[PDB]
Design an enzyme around this catalytic site. Sequence first.
Site, mmCIF file in Angstrom:
data_model
loop_
_atom_site.group_PDB
_atom_site.id
_atom_site.type_symbol
_atom_site.label_atom_id
_atom_site.label_comp_id
_atom_site.label_asym_id
_atom_site.label_seq_id
_atom_site.Cartn_x
_atom_site.Cartn_y
_atom_site.Cartn_z
ATOM 1 N N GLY A 126 -43.414 33.755 14.999
ATOM 2 C CA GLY A 126 -44.251 33.245 16.153
ATOM 3 C C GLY A 126 -43.482 32.138 16.833
ATOM 4 O O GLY A 126 -43.633 31.830 17.798
ATOM 5 N N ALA A 341 -33.921 48.481 48.934
ATOM 6 C CA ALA A 341 -33.152 47.198 48.485
ATOM 7 C C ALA A 341 -33.623 46.179 49.621
ATOM 8 O O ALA A 341 -33.967 44.914 49.208
ATOM 9 C CB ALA A 341 -31.971 47.558 48.175
HETATM 10 C C1 LIG Z 1 -37.033 53.379 54.453
HETATM 11 C C2 LIG Z 1 -36.554 53.979 53.107
HETATM 12 O O1 LIG Z 1 -37.665 53.437 52.368
HETATM 13 C C3 LIG Z 1 -37.581 53.527 51.021
HETATM 14 C C4 LIG Z 1 -36.552 54.122 50.151
HETATM 15 C C5 LIG Z 1 -36.450 53.791 48.810
HETATM 16 C C6 LIG Z 1 -37.261 53.250 48.155
HETATM 17 O O2 LIG Z 1 -36.889 53.218 46.872
HETATM 18 C C7 LIG Z 1 -36.698 51.837 46.310
HETATM 19 N N1 LIG Z 1 -36.530 50.818 46.908
HETATM 20 C C8 LIG Z 1 -36.401 49.597 46.188
HETATM 21 C C9 LIG Z 1 -35.956 49.705 44.928
HETATM 22 C C10 LIG Z 1 -35.526 48.111 44.099
HETATM 23 F F1 LIG Z 1 -36.514 47.198 44.587
HETATM 24 F F2 LIG Z 1 -35.789 48.449 42.978
HETATM 25 F F3 LIG Z 1 -34.520 47.949 44.435
HETATM 26 C C11 LIG Z 1 -36.027 50.780 44.119
HETATM 27 C C12 LIG Z 1 -36.380 51.949 44.881
HETATM 28 CL CL1 LIG Z 1 -36.539 53.456 44.005
HETATM 29 C C13 LIG Z 1 -38.316 52.588 48.897
HETATM 30 C C14 LIG Z 1 -38.409 52.623 50.154
HETATM 31 C C15 LIG Z 1 -36.583 55.343 53.355
HETATM 32 O O3 LIG Z 1 -37.341 56.235 53.308
HETATM 33 O O4 LIG Z 1 -35.096 55.583 53.566
HETATM 34 C C1 LIG Z 2 -47.768 35.371 12.150
HETATM 35 C C2 LIG Z 2 -46.285 35.830 12.596
HETATM 36 O O1 LIG Z 2 -46.223 35.659 14.233
HETATM 37 C C3 LIG Z 2 -45.459 36.299 15.040
HETATM 38 C C4 LIG Z 2 -44.436 37.204 14.528
HETATM 39 C C5 LIG Z 2 -43.673 37.589 15.749
HETATM 40 C C6 LIG Z 2 -44.161 37.770 16.980
HETATM 41 O O2 LIG Z 2 -43.185 38.457 17.751
HETATM 42 C C7 LIG Z 2 -43.806 39.431 18.295
HETATM 43 N N1 LIG Z 2 -45.265 39.819 18.439
HETATM 44 C C8 LIG Z 2 -45.707 40.772 19.300
HETATM 45 C C9 LIG Z 2 -44.712 41.611 19.767
HETATM 46 C C10 LIG Z 2 -45.355 42.773 20.516
HETATM 47 F F1 LIG Z 2 -46.447 42.251 21.250
HETATM 48 F F2 LIG Z 2 -44.466 43.491 21.152
HETATM 49 F F3 LIG Z 2 -45.821 43.715 19.616
HETATM 50 C C11 LIG Z 2 -43.347 41.422 19.772
HETATM 51 C C12 LIG Z 2 -42.839 40.283 19.254
HETATM 52 CL CL1 LIG Z 2 -41.275 40.068 18.915
HETATM 53 C C13 LIG Z 2 -45.055 36.845 17.187
HETATM 54 C C14 LIG Z 2 -45.719 36.204 16.404
HETATM 55 C C15 LIG Z 2 -45.260 35.264 12.164
HETATM 56 O O3 LIG Z 2 -44.752 34.113 12.438
HETATM 57 O O4 LIG Z 2 -44.886 35.596 10.957
#
Ligand SMILES: C[C@@H](Oc1ccc(Oc2ncc(C(F)(F)F)cc2Cl)cc1)C(=O)O
Ligand SMILES: C[C@@H](Oc1ccc(Oc2ncc(C(F)(F)F)cc2Cl)cc1)C(=O)O
Lengths: 440, 441
Positions: A126, A341
């Site tokens: 934790g 983007a």
């Molecule tokens: C106008 C344009 O519109 C889009 C195109 C791709 C599109 O997909 C993504 N846009 C942004 C991301 C980001 F934010 F992760 F970079 C990812 C995707 Cl797949 C969203 C709108 C199109 O249809 O050509």
């Molecule tokens: C009581 C226990 O506490 C923890 C231990 C690990 C811990 O880390 C994570 N807890 C949950 C996740 C999840 F939600 F992804 F499952 C991930 C981690 Cl690293 C958080 C609290 C300890 O300190 O031993």
Amino acid sequence: LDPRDPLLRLSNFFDDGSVELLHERDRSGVLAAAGTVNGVRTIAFCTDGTVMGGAMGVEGCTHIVNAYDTAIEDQSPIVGIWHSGGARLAEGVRALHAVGQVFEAMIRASGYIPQISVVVGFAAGGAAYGPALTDVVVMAPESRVFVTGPASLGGPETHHKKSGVCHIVADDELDAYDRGRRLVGLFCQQGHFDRSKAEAGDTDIHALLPESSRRAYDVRPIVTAILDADTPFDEFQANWAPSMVVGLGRLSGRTVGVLANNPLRLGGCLNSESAKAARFVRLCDAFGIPLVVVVDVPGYLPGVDQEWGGVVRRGAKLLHAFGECTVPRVTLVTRKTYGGAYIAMNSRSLNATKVFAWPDAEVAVMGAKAAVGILHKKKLAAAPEHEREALHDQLAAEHERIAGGVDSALDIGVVDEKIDPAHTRSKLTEALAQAPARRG
Amino acid sequence: DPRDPLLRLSNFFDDGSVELLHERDRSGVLAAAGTVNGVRTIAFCTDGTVMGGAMGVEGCTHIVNAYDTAIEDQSPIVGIWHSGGARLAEGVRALHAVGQVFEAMIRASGYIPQISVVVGFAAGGAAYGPALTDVVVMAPESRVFVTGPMASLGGPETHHKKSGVCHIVADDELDAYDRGRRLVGLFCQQGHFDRSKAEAGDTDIHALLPESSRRAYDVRPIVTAILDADTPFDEFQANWAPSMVVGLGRLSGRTVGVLANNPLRLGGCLNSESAEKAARFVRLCDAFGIPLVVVVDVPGYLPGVDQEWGGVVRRGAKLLHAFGECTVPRVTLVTRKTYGGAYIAMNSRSLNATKVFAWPDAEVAVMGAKAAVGILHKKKLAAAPEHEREALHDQLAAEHERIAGGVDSALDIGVVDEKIDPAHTRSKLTEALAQAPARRG
Ligand SMILES: C[C@@H](Oc1ccc(Oc2ncc(C(F)(F)F)cc2Cl)cc1)C(=O)O
Ligand SMILES: C[C@@H](Oc1ccc(Oc2ncc(C(F)(F)F)cc2Cl)cc1)C(=O)O
Ligand SMILES: C[C@@H](Oc1ccc(Oc2ncc(C(F)(F)F)cc2Cl)cc1)C(=O)O
Ligand SMILES: C[C@@H](Oc1ccc(Oc2ncc(C(F)(F)F)cc2Cl)cc1)C(=O)O
């Protein structure tokens, strides 16, 4: 041991003479105190590495929760200093539950008061996880994090710098406190914009670009140029998702956040990890910190085995983060910005406060060659195969010469103003200062 | 032409209910109002008969207006998608207009339910728009094209069901609309808890557990046992992050959300994508007043690739935030074991769980006995001769188990509210969710 003494560490973080304990000093494994950081009333707590290796128990966790309640009630920034092997195993479920209550305190404080973690020693269970719930994590180079399934043991320079959980890696423990200290200043002494100071800092930032628009460069010096000359840029997560640069600095004295595509990596493309941007946008939005968005992005990329899930989902978060944002957020398009983007990088459609462009900037649905492949499909199809590619290149060259372009983008209204890049810094300041503190 | 928007809208809406929000045109979008089993719904359909359904300024404007209308009326909104993406000839104007659709979806997020039904080819803005909505249903003949500046071209069965963007894959187009319709009813006809209906459906759900606690099993029959016996469990993302099962169904007629660790995969452990899958789902139910049943059997959490921890650490935080902030009722049932940080994440009392139940042989602990002992008794174990070390370890473990892990200990501390007869699991859960406030925790 003496160097791990909580009061000592706390006294090293706080302004000299400002420490007032929130409870009687005991052997609970934590010590909470009020103090000031350059005059800002601040709550802090420190795990006690001198007692069972800083292991977190019921009484210790109660001190942390109490400190959080105190910080929330006073609306004061809260800083945790960590050196702890996790929960006290012998206390069993009681400690388990107590730990979760720390988390719940952190969740209640989230976006309401700044939470800064400083990791100075060993951290596991934790005590490794706690920091993950805060806003900015600073790691001392000596700090070690351990996590295992039902396994990793690393320092920041060896692991966590490259995993996006650590925001800032310090030179030493003392320096870690200094950065922590500077972080509360950035959140709690945000200052004001000053036109004159902004103007006096103006340079031809455009000269930092390479000669060919088709080639990569490091955007970091451009960020440097925009921000106040002799004030540090506190970059977050510099070695994680490096196609995206984010961090806090000052612009004519006023705390601002910066996001900038970095062509140095993946041509500046967005991908899963870099869409880093979303979380940063929410951080500044939470605390009234305006944003400068420097856009040079040719598109988005999938992950390892060409998997698209991450970027589609993380991208969605980015869209939401900007679309919901209400602090001023000004976009500067330096070179290229295409397609989805573009929409995601603080576009007008997402309520960008203002969008500036450099004279040679390009805004388009897609790359010239792709567009032309679609627009002139008939001529391309009918061509002999051995001339088809030459024709395609000719079409693409002409399309990029006469289409895209700031003038067309100004006409539509997706770009508000084309600016002399020599006044980049001053124009940005003006747009941010003239913006309402909220709404948009 | 089967791709006619009015035809598709009519196949979605109640027969006769269709009222257009604008005059038909060639903008590439038709938006209309109607009802879905009585509830007023707003829907739009891209027009695949016109330029492959490519989205232009006027079509986008029709979608934005449809969004404004649905937001104004607090009506759910359903998009039917068949589009190659933006109209390239319109250039930046169309790009801008696509963003405006996204902006409208963001404004609607958390306020009205948004359901996407992908029925044909989807690219660009047309693939991405659904990604901004709450629940995506995919017809098997739908195909998504996504590309960088390689690329991916697939359908639901080969690509997207396994990537977490698609929530539900249907049998055919008509079946897709039917799933869509049912989703509207789940969000907009949540109904009410019935104690008698709950009891009559009680079974010994414990019988669905393996005799041995070391052995895997499928949690889905347990979920099925809990929910109304002749009502679909609309599982989301069944093939993405399969160590976690989430979805919507009815509990004595009342719409509920279920989250359940599934020991069928990765031992039921949390990891990057299962944390993300739960966190979004909790946010979705919290957003619309849907109470949650949390069936917990989680031994810990797992890294990524390559043993990358970044993902599970960050997505885990999201999961913690989601439960920590949740205000709809959320009841936990610990079936076998829950350990450590994972235990904290899975709707623990420390995160304001409404009620925590456990089956008699359940265990709640920071870790397994053997592991706790390996740490607590490190010296004796090391000092022990190698021939005798294991026996010593198991002896200490058996003793340690007596005072750590069991429900009785948990009850005393207060992390578990009540130990229950598994034969009354269904009715006991119903009661706890029924008497919880609609909002706080
Ligand atoms: C106008 C344009 O519109 C889009 C195109 C791709 C599109 O997909 C993504 N846009 C942004 C991301 C980001 F934010 F992760 F970079 C990812 C995707 Cl797949 C969203 C709108 C199109 O249809 O050509
Ligand atoms: C009581 C226990 O506490 C923890 C231990 C690990 C811990 O880390 C994570 N807890 C949950 C996740 C999840 F939600 F992804 F499952 C991930 C981690 Cl690293 C958080 C609290 C300890 O300190 O031993
Ligand atoms: C196997 C495939 O998985 C994908 C493919 C496309 C992809 O992007 C989308 N998937 C589904 C939709 C939907 F369902 F909304 F139409 C949209 C997108 Cl952008 C996400 C994961 C891959 O990663 O290559
Ligand atoms: C390179 C390494 O990355 C890690 C390692 C540990 C890890 O867990 C934590 N790392 C840092 C902190 C911090 F900074 F808060 F102390 C916390 C955790 Cl749980 C996350 C990613 C990996 O993925 O194996």
